[PDB]
């Protein structure tokens, strides 16, 4: 790695910061409240009596958390179309409000429950808009809505003067006039009561059998959300490097204990650096500190390659109990970082290769890379006393060589 990062097949003695290392996340944790208002879909799907489609029911679903997977994963629905939305990502999306509409129709009429459709149901009972955002969910109900002799509880509008607008309803019972002959409020030639009842005997073919429908309409608007998909959660772990998501605050770090007392309304905690110092667990309401997964430059300590191919490694800063388990047996904790491969000794020398905080390393005795606290110098007692002087008997004429830079390569680009 040194030869690679220095881009040379030869290396001079020293310490080289070839790369950086990080403790990897072991798993991903998710936390969200475990007490929530579930959206009341049950009472619109499992009502005993549904609406007549001419008088189709609507219920507002709002201020709640949904789980549309409970619906879509069920096998009982015969049809589950969605428009502008996908049935899977429906469980990840969130909405300002939802309207659940329900009615009973013939099986042949389910195909009219789509945007842009036409025909007696689409035109005169239940009209979807051209840009409909919702889902249409339907199932056969010949187990409930039919009986021997026929069930005539349910009705549909057979006649109208004009087509319904999207999500319009019309429950008026005025006798329709189909021609120039005035009806004067009574049925007759060209004069027909506007509603008709389905022939729901149970023995009919599937197209004539009753079907129940629920249509879910989603209000994607600039208004605030009130109906989101499920606020999932995992089990909680501590003192391990993990990915985390707390109420959407999402990151990677070591979750750990805290004694920092949040105020009751507070959810997130930040340091002097606008960075997440702590978070409340939305379930236990405990406060967790978040600390970064430990990381550092990893530095390779080498004699010259002319001397040896053996090298030691210093992981800057980090604790040896944390360093990943590349093959070295010797391990030592400098205050500069966890040192691996190098061998601690109790001798001292001039600082051959500096590590930091007084530690230096050298290739020495059968050779190994020893690591030692540096010698400042020889230790000397200066033999002072109040009446003694030392005077040189002899002298040495030194020649000391000193070198100074003066210029550098004149260049222009």
């Amino acid at each position: 790695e040194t030869k690679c990062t220095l881009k040379s097949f030869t290396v001079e003695k020293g310490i080289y910061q070839t790369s950086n290392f990080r403790v990897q996340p072991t798993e991903s944790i998710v936390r969200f409240p475990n007490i929530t208002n579930l959206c009341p879909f049950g009472e619109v799907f499992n009502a005993t009596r549904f609406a007549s489609v001419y008088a189709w029911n609507r219920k507002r679903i709002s201020n709640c958390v949904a789980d549309y997977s409970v619906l879509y994963n069920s096998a009982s629905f015969s049809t589950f179309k969605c428009y502008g939305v996908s049935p899977t990502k429906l469980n990840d999306l969130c909405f300002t409000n939802v309207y659940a509409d329900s009615f009973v129709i013939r099986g042949d009429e389910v195909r009219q429950i789509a945007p842009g459709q036409t025909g007696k149901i689409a035109d005169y009972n239940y009209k979807l808009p051209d840009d409909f955002t919702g889902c249409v969910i339907a199932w056969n109900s010949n187990n409930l809505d039919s009986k021997v002799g026929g069930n005539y509880n349910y009705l549909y509008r057979l006649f109208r003067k004009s087509n319904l607008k999207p999500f319009e309803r019309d429950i008026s019972t005025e006798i329709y006039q189909a021609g120039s002959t005035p009806c004067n409020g009574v049925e007759g030639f060209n004069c027909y009561f506007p509603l008709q009842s389905y022939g729901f005997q149970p023995t009919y073919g599937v197209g004539y059998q009753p079907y129940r429908v629920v249509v879910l309409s989603f209000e994607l608007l600039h208004a605030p959300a009130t109906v989101c998909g499920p606020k999932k959660s995992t089990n909680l772990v501590k003192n391990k490097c993990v990915n985390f998501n707390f109420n959407g605050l999402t990151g990677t770090g070591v979750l750990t204990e805290s004694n920092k007392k949040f105020l009751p309304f507070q959810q997130f905690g930040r340091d002097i650096d606008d960075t997440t110092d702590a978070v409340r667990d939305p379930q236990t309401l405990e406060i967790l500190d978040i600390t970064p997964c430990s990381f550092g430059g990893v530095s390779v300590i080498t004699p010259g390659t002319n001397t040896s191919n053996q090298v030691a490694v210093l992981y800057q800063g980090v604790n040896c109990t944390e360093v990943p388990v590349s093959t070295g047996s010797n391990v030592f904790q400098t205050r500069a970082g966890c040192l691996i491969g190098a061998e601690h000794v109790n001798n001292s020398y001039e600082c051959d290769i500096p590590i930091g905080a007084g530690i230096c390393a050298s290739y020495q005795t059968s050779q190994s890379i020893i690591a030692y606290t540096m010698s400042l110098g020889a230790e000397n007692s200066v033999a002072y006393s109040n009446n003694s002087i030392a005077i040189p008997i002899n002298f040495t004429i030194s020649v000391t060589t000193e070198i100074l830079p003066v210029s550098m390569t004149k260049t222009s680009v």
Partner: protein, 147 residues
């Protein structure tokens, strides 16, 4: 230029122009800082030329360890070398010493030197090289009485 039409080749080249301009202005800045370092070694090399070579320096440990006698300059690529000749005291010997000598009520201090005893007999000698001399009226000066 070989592959894209001008109206969007401009957009691709504008990225290379920004990146290569930012690359070059970073190099130019770091050369201005390096130049401000070599300039300080050229001002020091000029100062050591004036003071160690053209002269003799009493600045301790400026013109090398020891007492500076003289230096010789030598050239080197992109630089200069100074050969600093220096006197270093060696093989020191212990002596008993005194601030002053008394006789006849007069306190004598050394002119240029220091008093030393060989264990039996008192001398004046210079500081930097053991060179014993008889203590005399011409190598000491009187000041005050012996109290």
């Amino acid at each position: 230029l070989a592959r894209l039409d001008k109206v969007e080749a401009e957009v691709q080249i504008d990225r290379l122009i920004t990146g290569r301009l930012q690359s070059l202005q970073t190099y130019v800045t770091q050369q201005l800082i390096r130049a401000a370092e070599i300039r300080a070694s050229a001002n020091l090399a000029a100062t050591k030329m004036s003071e160690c070579v053209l002269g003799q320096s009493k600045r301790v440990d400026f013109c090398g360890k020891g007492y500076h006698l003289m230096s010789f300059p030598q050239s080197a690529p992109h630089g200069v070398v100074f050969l600093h000749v220096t006197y270093i005291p060696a093989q020191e010997k212990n002596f008993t010493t005194a601030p002053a000598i008394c006789h006849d009520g007069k306190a004598h201090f050394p002119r240029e030197g220091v008093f030393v005893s060989n264990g039996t007999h008192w001398f004046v000698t210079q500081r930097n090289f053991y060179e014993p001399q008889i203590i005399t009226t011409h190598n000491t000066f009187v000041s005050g009485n012996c109290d």
